[PDB]
Structures are given as C-alpha cells and as structure tokens.
Design a protein around this ligand. Structure first.
Ligand SMILES: *[C@@H]1O[C@H](CO[C@@H]2O[C@@H](C)[C@@H](O)[C@@H](O)[C@@H]2O)[C@@H](O)[C@H](O)[C@H]1NC(C)=O
Ligand code: HI6
Ligand code: HI6
Ligand code: NAG
Ligand code: NAG
Lengths: 535, 533
C-alpha cells in the first residue's frame, strides 16, 4: 500500500480489499469484483449450506470477476449472440461463491440505497459477471450502490434429499441469503445503506426474490423487492420434497451412485458428470421446466409458495413486478418441434397440440384439450401464424404472466404496495427473429443501462428509454415508489390493486396505464386449471 | 258468394274470407281440418287423415287452440299475453290456415309453412304475430300454418308402446305437410316449392323434419329461427320420456296399455296441472314433453344425425336474436324481473347457472361461471346480469345454431345465417332484456306494415326488407334480391369463413364467427368435461 489509488482501498469483515476504477460513459465508478462471501462449497461441502467466508490476510484483489458456478452451457446455437450472451464468461468452478459491488467514484459521502441483483437461468445457470448485469451505469448515473452475487445452481445448488443432513436442499438460496447477510454487515464500508436494500432479479432470479419474501429469516435482510418475469409460485420454481427426492436419487443412479451413502458417493463424482446428467431427470418432455430447483422443504419454504402467498401478511412490503411482451417465445426454439430462430416457425395444428403437451407437461389429456380449446382461434383454427403465436402465449401465460398476475393479486389483497408493468420494447440490436417479439430476459439490458454505452449501437431513443427505466427502478429502491417525486408533468404509475388491476406499459412512448393483466386468460390458468387437475 | 273464396280440396268444399291487408285484399281460409280430432282413444296416438265432408265447410275463422298450459306470470301484461291462446282450448285442434293473394295466384306460388314455437307445451297458429296476410298481400306468398298437439297431448311417450309412441305433435305437423302437397295447388300454391319456417320449438320442429326421411319429400327449403333439433332442450331420450310419462301417470293416479288407458280417462287440465312437475331438476329453457329419440321419427339423436347426414340438396336459413336468454330468466332465476333492472350478485349468478345449465356437474357449472365472469369486473351486477342472459341464450340457442349451421354447411347444405338486433319500439319488456327470444317474428310476418300498430316508419321499411329476404329465400333458396345490385350481399355461411349478417335498421353487415370462442366452449369442451368428470 502507498502508491495505489487510496479511493479504492476498503476493509470488510473478512479483511482488506482493493477495487478497480471503471470507466462508465458519464464518468468513473468503483468496482469491487470477486469478493468471497462463503467458504468454497467444495469436496465435503458440496450440497451443503454455505459457511461464512473465513477472514483472509493481506489485501484481497477485487479487480476481476471470480469463477462462475459449475453449470450446463447451452450449445443449441453455437456462436449466436442471442444464446452466448447468457453463457459463462469466467472459468466454471464449484469454488464460485463471490459477490460484486459497484458504487459511485469516489464512494458516496452519505448512506446510499442498495440494489441487490439475483440472476436467472432456470436455477441451472447464470453468473453475476455477465455483461447484461454490469452495475456501472446504475452506479454512475443513479449513484446506486449495486451488489450482485453468484449462487450455486443445478445439482450443486438444488439437489435435495429432503430431511437429510448432507443434502437438505435449497442451498443455492442459502448462498443468496448469506450474500444478503454480507451486505447487511459490510455494505456501509462502501457507502451503502444496509437500512435500504432492494432485491431485484429476473426469471429464476425473480423467483428467488419472491422466495426471500416468503422466508422469514430473509425478511430482515431487505426492504423492497422487484420481480422481473418470475415468481416463487407457478409450475417451474419449486418441486415437492417427494419429487426432489425422486430426481436426486435418479441423478444418483445415472452417475453410478440411506441418504448418507448416496450423498457421500455423489460428492466423489466429477462436477461435470453431474452437469452431464442433470437434464435427464425431468419426468416428462418439457420446456420451461428445470431439474434442480428450490424444494418445499418445510424449512426455507415452510409450505408451498401458493399457500404462503395466499395466507401471508405483506403489510410492510413494496414490490415491483412485471413481464415482457413475449415471455414464451424464447422457450419454443429449445424443445417444441416446428420452432426455430432461423425461420418464421409457422406450425401446423398437429404441432400446436404436441407443443401444448410439452409446454404444459403436467396436464392430463382433458387439461391439455382445455388449453388447446382456449388458445385456438375458432375462426382460423388451422392458421399457422395464429398457432405459432398461441403456442408462445401458452408457454408465456402458464409460466410467467399468470403466475405474475396471481402474485400481484395475492400481495395487493394482503397489504403490500404493488407496482406492475409490461415491458414491450424490442431492442433494435436484438438477434432473435421478429416473430419472437420481446423475449424473456430482453428487458434486463435496459434496466441495467447498457444503451448508455455508445459502443453498443442502441438508438438515441433507447438511451433515453434506458434512463427512464433506471429512474423508475432506483426511485423504487429509494422510496418504494417508482414515480418521480419532483416530476408531476410525466404520466404517473399507479399501484396495482385487486379492484382496478392497473399496470403500465414500458416502451418508447410515455407511460400508458392499462387494466387487468390477461385477466380473462389468467382466470383459466389460476382458477380453473387447478380444479380440472384434481378431477 | 265470392268465387275467389270457394275452394275444393280432396276432403270437399271450403269457404274462406276476404281479409283486408293495408295493400289490399287477401283470401284467408282458416280452420281447415287436416286430421280426425285426436280425442278419446285417439289421445296420444298418431293423427289420422280427416274424413271427407259434405256441403261447404266454413273456413272463415281460426279454430280452437290445442290444449295447453296458459301462462300466469304477469297476468294481463301484453309481453306474456301475446303468446297465450287467443281461441278456446280444445284437444280437437288439428286445423290449419291458408292465406293467399286476392285474387288467388295466376300461376303456382311458393309456399311458406309456419310452425309455431312455445317449448312444445304451448302455441297456436292463430296468434296475431303469425298473421299471414301481410306476406300474402305484399310478397304474393301462399302462407300456411297448422296447429299441432303440444304438452302431454303432443309428446307424452311410452317408447315402444302402440298407443303412446311419442312424437305425435310432429306427426301432426307432417300430416299438415302432406295436406299441403295434396291440396295446396287448389289455392294457387306450388307443392314443388314449399319452405318451412318456424321459431324456437317451431324451428326445432323444422330441424326434425330435416332429420326425418318421411318428411323430406314434403318440403324443399327450411328456416330455423332461434331453435334447433340438436341442443339441450329440443329432445329427450326414450328412457327419460318413459320416466316422465310414468311420473305424470303416477301424479294423476294412474304394463303400458293399462297406464295409457288410464291417462286417456283424465280430463285435459288434470294432465296440464302436473306437466311441469316431471322435470328432473329446477331449470329454465327446459320442457317436460318434447320430441323423443324413438328410433323411428328420429332414427338417432339430432347430434348423430346432423354429424352424419347428407344435406346436398337442401337450403337453410338459420339465425338468432341479440338476447336469446333474457326472456327465460324471469321464469325461474332469482333476482330477475321485468319490473326492475335485475342487477344481481355473484352468488345469484352461480345459483342462476345451476338453473340455466341444470345438467351441469359442479365442475362444469364452475367452468361456465369462470368463462362468463368478466374478470376485470367480477362482481359488477350489470355484467353478471348480462352474463346470465348470455349463458342461457348461448347454451340453448346460439351455440346449437352455430353447431347446426356448421354441420349443415360441411355436409353439402346451402346455409345462410343471421343475428337479429332490432328491438321493437313497441316492446313492453324492460331494456335490460334487449332483443328477447321471439321478438323478430312480428317483423318477419310484416306486422309493422299495419298503421294501427304504431311501429315507426323505419320499422315498416325494415319489416319490408325482412319479408323480402324470407320470401326470396322461399322462392330460390337464396335470400338475396335477384335484381338488387347494391346491398351488400348476404353470403352463404360456411365452415371456413363462418359469415353471417346482422338484421337491424342499418344495411346488412357481414360478420364472421357466430360466438366462435364461446361456442367452442359449449360445443367442444363441455361435452368432454361432463362425460369425463
Ligand atoms: C423451421 O425450422 C425447424 C428446424 O430447422 C431445422 O432447422 C431449420 C432452420 C430448417 O431450415 C431445416 O434445416 C431443419 O428442419 C423445423 O422443424 C421446421 O419444420 C421449420 N419450418 C419449416 C417448415 O421450414
Ligand atoms: N438442467 C436443466 O434443467 C435444463 C433445463 C432446460 N434446459 C433448456 O435450455 C433451454 N433454455 C435456455 C435458456 C433458458 C431456459 C431454457 C429452458 N427451456 O426449457 C437446459 C437445462
Ligand atoms: N310444461 C313446461 O315444460 C313448462 C316450462 C316452462 N314454463 C314457463 O314458461 C316460460 N316460457 C315462456 C315462453 C317460452 C318458454 C318458456 C320456458 N321457460 O323455461 C311453463 C311450462
Ligand atoms: C457497432 O457498430 C460498429 C460500426 O459499424 C461495428 O463495427 C461494431 O461491431 C458494432 N458493435 C456492436 C456490439 O454491435
Ligand atoms: C327486482 O325484483 C325481483 C323479483 O321480485 C327481486 O328479487 C329483486 O329485489 C329485484 N332485482 C334486483 C336483484 O335488483
């Protein structure tokens, strides 16, 4: 120490850190990347809850992202930007429990509201180090303190033998919770306010946020939450104990392995062997379904997300929730025959009915026919364009839009302040075909402020749009209200209520208020389909 | 003695009456016996042809109304009373009426045969709304209407028995159709151009004649207004008919011969008094004694026969009014009245659904409620009221119509479809009821052309348009004016395009898909849900 930048040296509970001055378009930011928040969950620690990081000696270099948690790498369209943007950008390792902090430079003078990002990727993938999660624009433009953590995914994070000591399940969620605890203890060192912490995440990340809302030990660790295209309730975000046990014990067989013996044997297996087999344990040909996800354990989750949202008191909570225009389309090209990024994906009626079975894999025959009946345009029942778009809607509505509608409704009925959005702008830079619309995940780059980087080739309107979104999000973090307190001229974003069911459109035009989030179709999924299942 | 009013038919001579239509005179021959009075041992039996008569039979007056239940819900209210018998009740009621131009047509004229509705338990060809003079004067039509037995008298069945075979009210209709074939040329009618039209239960009757081979040689084209042979109310199975007749016989104090013989001893009103007590559930748009799938008149269910029939040489005009269900709500569903806005609660909506869809399981009724609830306005009483009407209308009329139209079109029939959306300015029902079941008839028959009735001038012009569609249809099987070169045209209904027209005060508008999404629920999904359960 002595010749370095004095404004980049910070101490946390575990010791000294040296960060890096990053260039954001408007000026410098401080980044502290690859901060360990847990003991490496390796060897005998695999499948186990994380233990806090033991203090280090000396100055830990925090200038580069750390390892990505061991994971499956999607190889469907090799070298295609649309798929590669989500793939690991650092070495895959089980030694991966590290977090990242961005702050203004120099660090804020007074306690600053903190945003904690939890990435998505089906609970089998993702990294806090991806370019779309770059906290420098929020830090620089909004003065935000931004934190993102890595958490264990796939088997390493979610393989459970429920009731066991050695693989109790949900440890990827405990990884996240430990980062939240780390922020509570340490964020003040960076100028962050531990008394104002907002969780935000997308897809599996948003399910994860919602699970922290529903899990008491987490509720002391944050104040507001944003759920983007994901929910703890719904068909994909959790599995019963029995189903987790079944999947884990099948995975075990598939790799050559009393839970103690089974688990001991799984711990002797190469990380890649587990990854190579994880996808093989799904009970049906599916899309938008993932092998190793949070388990209703009677611990982290004391009951099903459905039951917990229905009976919970959510008085002291503000939540921002929303969806993109086309939640389902991304998933079609990965498992539904007739669908491709490289053509118009105009499908036949036969391909529609096969796709409903894949998209709603838990459905009986009658339930599947109810879905088909509902989603068919009976004026044009064989029209390939309508069938393609209805297949998309089926998947989007079932997995995202209607779970989101359900969550916003239950939360608002029970005292939470809720704000709802539909994100409808398709990035001019998008590499997916037009038919896919505004796919799952393609709002993130705007919320994080990437269009502000002149080297990325977004339009001027997209720059301004991104700035708007950054304001909503940081205004919400700051106050639990995304509206500008100053700006009475701009259109206002009303809270979502059960009575009026209001939400706003997020696109290049000013905020437009709409009513009912697929109210008619979501009654099908949320009220009728359950009753039809049990019959 | 006016020679225009003297006609010889196979049974003998008839004397009709010169009636006045606003345009000029018409010849009416009313109260012509087409059958032996179905009295005594003939009760419940098929009709027999009327024996020849001596001298000149007086046909200047409507005959008696077939014995039936008279409605008492709103006594002396024109909206209910206009359907009530307007001549004396009698089992001796098998008579028919013929209007013709005056002087009678110079050349063979297309015949329209009206079959009234009234749920198979009521109705008469003598009601003012079925008055054939306007069509005869203005359109030059030969119009025929018959009485046919209704209620237990027309439809009580002990299927398999010789003496209560079921379907005799339909056999009455058929006999009148045979009468027209044998006799109509004497009035100037063309027996080679006969068009059946009817409404509600009369439209279902028309559809049954389409589905029964012996009837098919007796007509060439058909119009079904607000009713179909298929659907939840128009027919019962043989088992359910047997059970209903056995219950009724039990109720009045009565081996089939023995049971039927005892029923024939009972005064007519004793049967009517217990008619309504044999329904399996509390319901609306459900009727006690209706056509029975006997394996004879109906060789299979209307559903089976429409699915598998060959309808190549047939033209059909089918349609519905804007608010098929509203009428039925005041007759069984709590919270509904003509005397207020009938704004209902959610609880009253679920209860109404069990009554409106009486055959529904808990789960099926829940599907109905969930489909018809506006989830933006779940508890809005105006929405719940209109949805209740729609449930009844769709279930009983709109969706059966769409189903029939589609099967007929797919199987070779030339089909035209309409929705009728003009509410008479003279209607005595409240506004919330909209355009109720039955309230297009007065327009088709041309009553607005009568200045004394106080319809608006626009309604007279509209009634004239409709009379033209119906008679053009009768003449040609195409309702379009053959020398009207701007319109636009009324296209045939097909399964691909599903085109139908709106009939209102504005020019024809073509629409596609007659409640397509909702009727898929009723026509495709419900059958699978009830059966599976
Ligand atoms: C659209 O693409 C699907 C899969 O593509 C395979 O990839 C595409 C790009 C084709 O060009 C061909 O090489 C392969 O079939 C097909 O399943 C689907 O049928 C395609 N749509 C049509 C009819 O071209
Ligand atoms: N291990 C797994 O559960 C798994 C499940 C699904 N996929 C499929 O990859 C397609 N995909 C790619 C990106 C995001 C989600 C999805 C899921 N679609 O069902 C890979 C691994
Ligand atoms: N005998 C019967 O089945 C019966 C059924 C219904 N009503 C009540 O009249 C109401 N109504 C009046 C005109 C046309 C049909 C209806 C049927 N509503 O359920 C009387 C007798
Ligand atoms: C942006 O545009 C420039 C200039 O045409 C091009 O060379 C560069 O590759 C583009 N970058 C991206 C990320 O699209
Ligand atoms: C109107 O009258 C009906 C029947 O008498 C009654 O149930 C109700 O009080 C009124 N309708 C509603 C539900 O407003």
């Amino acid at each position: 120490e002595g010749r370095e930048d004095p404004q980049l040296l910070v101490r946390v509970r575990g010791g000294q850190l040296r960060g890096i001055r990053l260039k954001a378009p408007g000026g410098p930011v401080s980044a502290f990347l690859g901060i360990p928040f847990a003991e490496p969950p390796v060897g005998s620690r695999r499948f186990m809850p994380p233990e806090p990081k033991r203090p280090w000696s000396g100055v830990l270099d925090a200038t580069t992202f750390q390892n990505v948690c061991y994971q499956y790498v999607d190889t469907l369209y090799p070298g295609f930007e649309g798929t590669e943007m989500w793939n690991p950008n650092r070495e895959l390792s089980e030694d991966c429990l590290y977090l990242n902090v961005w702050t203004p430079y120099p660090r804020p003078a007074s306690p600053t509201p903190v945003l904690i990002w939890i990435y998505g990727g089906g609970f089998y993938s993702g990294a806090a180090s991806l370019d779309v999660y770059d906290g420098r624009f929020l830090a620089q433009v909004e003065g935000a303190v931004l934190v993102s953590m890595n958490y264990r995914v796939g088997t390493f994070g979610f393989l459970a033998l429920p009731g066991s000591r050695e693989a109790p399940g949900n440890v990827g969620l405990l990884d996240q919770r430990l980062a939240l605890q780390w922020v509570q203890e340490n964020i003040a060192a960076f100028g962050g306010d531990p008394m104002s912490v907002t969780l935000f995440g997308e897809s599996a990340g948003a399910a994860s946020v919602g699970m922290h809302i529903l899990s008491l030990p987490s509720r002391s660790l944050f104040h507001r939450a944003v759920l983007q295209s994901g929910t703890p309730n719904g068909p994909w975000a959790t599995v019963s104990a029995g189903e987790a046990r079944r999947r884990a014990t099948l995975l075990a067989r598939l790799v050559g392995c009393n839970d103690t013996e089974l688990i001991a044997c799984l711990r002797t297996r190469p990380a890649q062997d587990l990854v190579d087999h994880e996808w093989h344990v799904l009970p049906q040909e599916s899309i938008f379904r993932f092998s190793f996800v949070p388990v209703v354990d009677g611990d982290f989750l004391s009951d099903t997300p459905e039951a917990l949202i229905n009976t919970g008191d959510f008085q002291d909570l503000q939540v921002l929730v929303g969806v993109v225009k086309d939640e389902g389309s991304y998933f079609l090209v990965y498992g539904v025959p007739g669908f491709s990024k490289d053509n118009e994906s105009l499908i036949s009626r036969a391909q529609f009915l096969a796709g409903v079975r894949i998209g709603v894999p838990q459905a009986s025959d009658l339930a599947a026919e109810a879905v088909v009946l509902h989603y068919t345009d009976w004026l044009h029942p064989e029209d390939p364009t309508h069938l393609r778009d209805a297949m998309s809607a089926v998947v989007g509505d079932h997995n995202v839009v209607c779970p989101v509608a359900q969550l916003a409704g239950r939360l608002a009925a029970q005292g939470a302040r809720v704000y709802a959005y539909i994100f409808e702008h398709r990035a001019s830079t998008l590499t997916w075909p037009l038919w896919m619309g505004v796919p799952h995940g393609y709002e993130i780059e705007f919320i994080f402020g990437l269009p502000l980087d002149p080297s990325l080739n977004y339009t001027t309107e997209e720059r301004i749009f991104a700035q708007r979104l950054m304001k909503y999000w940081t205004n919400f973090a700051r106050t639990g209200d995304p509206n500008d307190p100053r700006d009475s001229k701009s259109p206002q974003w009303p809270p979502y209520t059960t009575a009026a069911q209001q939400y706003v459109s997020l696109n290049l035009k000013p905020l437009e208020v709409r009513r009912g989030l697929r109210a008619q179709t979501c009654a099908f999924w949320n009220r009728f389909l359950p009753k039809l299942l049990s019959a």
